[PDB]
Amino acid sequence: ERLDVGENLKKAEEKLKKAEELLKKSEEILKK
Amino acid sequence: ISLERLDVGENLKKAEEKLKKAEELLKKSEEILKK
Amino acid sequence: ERLDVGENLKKAEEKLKKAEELLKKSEEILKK
Amino acid sequence: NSQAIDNLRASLETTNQAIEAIRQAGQEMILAVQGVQDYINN
Amino acid sequence: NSQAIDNLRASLETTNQAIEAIRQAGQEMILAVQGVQDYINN
Amino acid sequence: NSQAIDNLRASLETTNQAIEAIRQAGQEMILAVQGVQDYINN
Ligand SMILES: [Zn+2]
Ligand SMILES: [Zn+2]
Ligand SMILES: [Zn+2]
Ligand SMILES: [Zn+2]
Ligand SMILES: [Zn+2]
Ligand SMILES: [Zn+2]
Ligand SMILES: [Zn+2]
Ligand SMILES: [Zn+2]
Ligand SMILES: [Zn+2]
Ligand SMILES: [Zn+2]
All residues of chain E having their beta carbon less than 8 Å from the beta carbon of residue F41 are none
Cβ distance F14 to C9 less than 8 Å, yes or no, reads no
CA B7 to centroid of ligand 1, rounded, Å = 22
Q: Which candidate, A15, E32, D26, places its Cα nearest to that of B19?
A: D26
D contact set with B (CB within 8 A) = 7-8, 10-12, 14-15, 17-19, 21-22, 24-26, 28-29, 31-33, 35-36, 39, 42
Residue-range definition of the domain harbouring residue D2: 1-42
Residue B29 one-letter amino acid: S
Q: Which candidate, B3, A7, A4, places its Cα nearest to that of F36?
A: A4
The DSSP string of A2-32 is ----HHHHHHHHHHHHHHHHHHHHHHHHHH-
Does A14 touch chain F if contact means CB atoms closer than 8 Å? Answer: no
User: How many Cβ pairs within 8 Å bridge chains A and F?
Assistant: 38
Q: Which of E13, E26, E37 sits opposite B15 (nearest CB)?
A: E26
CA torsion E9-E15-E21-E27 (nearest 10°) is -110
Experimental approach was X-ray
What is the Cα–Cα distance from D34 to D40, expressed in whole angstroms? Answer: 10
3-state secondary structure of B8: coil
All residues of chain E having their beta carbon less than 8 Å from the beta carbon of residue D39 are 40
Best of E3, E15, E27 to mutate (most A CBs within 10 Å, chain A): E15
What is the Cα–Cα distance from D29 to F33, expressed in whole angstroms? Answer: 10
Four-residue CA torsion sign, F36, F38, F41, F42? negative
H helix and E strand count, chain F: 1, 0
CB-based burial label for C31 (10 Å; 0-12, 13-18, 19+): exposed
Half-sphere exposure of E2 (CA within 13 A, CB side): 0
Burial C2-30 (b: 16+ CB within 10 A, else e): ebebeebbebbbebbebbbebbeebbebb
Count how many domains chain E has: 1
Q: Which candidate, D13, D36, A27, places its Cα nearest to that of E29?
A: D36
